[PDB]
């Protein structure tokens, strides 16, 4: 609806800053579901070389 | 009658347009109060119109 009737460019940019708003947050549990993950899957080897154990 | 009959309406009819007068006013801005809500787009243009 931009630039045509109802947009009511404000209240299109509230919308947008939401799609805006809320993807961040999605970067957020990303972040975080991206952390617990390396948490889990962390378990366990190998350190950072390999050979003889 | 006729006498007291319109000299009531012109004056009660002054007081009409006083009224819508202002009331004009009152859309007047109403209508500016749009225009710019609607130039900054804040609102639409359809309450413009």
Same mark, same amino acid.
């Given at each position: 609806?931009l ?6 460019? /404000?209240?299109?940019? /509230?919308?947008? %800053?939401?799609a805006?708003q809320a993807? %961040?947050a999605?970067?957020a ?5 991206e952390?617990?993950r ?16 | 009658?006729t006498?007291?009959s319109?000299?009531? +309406? $012109?004056?009660?009819? $002054?007081?009409? $347009? +006083? ?21 900054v787009?804040?609102?639409?243009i359809?309450?413009?119109?």
């Amino acid at each position: 609806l931009l630039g045509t009737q109802y947009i009511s460019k /404000q209240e299109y940019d /509230q919308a947008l %800053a939401d799609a805006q708003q809320a993807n %961040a947050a999605v970067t957020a549990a990303k972040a975080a579901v991206e952390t617990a993950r390396i948490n889990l899957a962390y378990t366990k080897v190998t350190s950072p070389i390999s050979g003889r154990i | 009658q006729t006498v007291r009959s319109s000299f009531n +309406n $012109i004056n009660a009819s $002054i007081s009409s $347009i +006083n009224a819508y007068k202002q009331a004009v006013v009152s859309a007047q801005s109403s209508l500016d109060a749009m225009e710019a809500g609607y130039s900054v787009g804040t609102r639409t243009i359809v309450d413009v119109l």
